[PDB]
Amino acid sequence: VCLFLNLANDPTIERIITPRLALTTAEFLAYQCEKHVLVILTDMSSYAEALREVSAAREEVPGRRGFPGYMYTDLATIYERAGRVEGRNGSITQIPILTMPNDDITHPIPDLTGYITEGQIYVDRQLHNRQIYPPINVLPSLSRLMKSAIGEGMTRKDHADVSNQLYACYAIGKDVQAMKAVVGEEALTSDDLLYLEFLQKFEKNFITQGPYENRTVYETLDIGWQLLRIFPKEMLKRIPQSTLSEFYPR
């Protein structure tokens, strides 16, 4: 682990020089040592603010919302340093973090960040406010390369269908809780109670892990199958029958 620190006391310009040092180091390690590096950037909002201050000191005309016009190009030249290179056994993966002022999804920083990058992961206030850690809200969380990242060989053959089934079951369970909120619990079918059971167990075990419970992918899929076992395979209509004959009766 390499570590770079820039406390908020230190000069504001050093804010917009820390990322460049980190990226240059990651480049040198990735393409001159053939390693597999994972760079993690924190609080890009502070980067934006420091860049804004540099621009305003430089007397340039303001752009949209007071942020400079070429913020797009700047974030592009920061994010675009990654991927894989033909003929070199190595790679660079980026996981930037940032905060949304006022929880506003149309704020420029997250907007541009979403445009340049691929995919997005959310955390939701309510889930943290349910004392659930990590408060990861999967309903609006997407991905762009999931289809090709996983597959036979590099993982088990039972991944994508399991993900689809978990998402579908959870969405049914949540909207069904919304329904029972007014329809009354008495008119609910027994399968409805099974959906509620899926909701509560999914939020109790799959999402909640604890700060040090180092789960692997295989453990994760094991817990996923265990949560799916509640229902019969007939309700599990996103899983192919071929894998049902193998995995469901475990």
Partner: protein, 50 residues
């Protein structure tokens, strides 16, 4: 309480004062008894419909 709104319903009650006894109509009490049974069952189903 069918839903959030409550609707009144009804129940079939046998109050207790038995059906009266006419044993003099030329001694035909059996037919009267089976007729009593028929109309009792009918009235049960009718209170359900109501």
């Amino acid at each position: 309480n069918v839903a959030g709104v409550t609707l009144p319903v009804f129940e079939h009650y046998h109050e207790g004062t038995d059906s009266y006894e006419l044993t003099g109509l030329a001694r035909g009490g059996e037919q009267l008894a089976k007729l009593k049974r028929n109309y009792a069952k009918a009235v049960e189903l009718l209170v359900e419909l109501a």
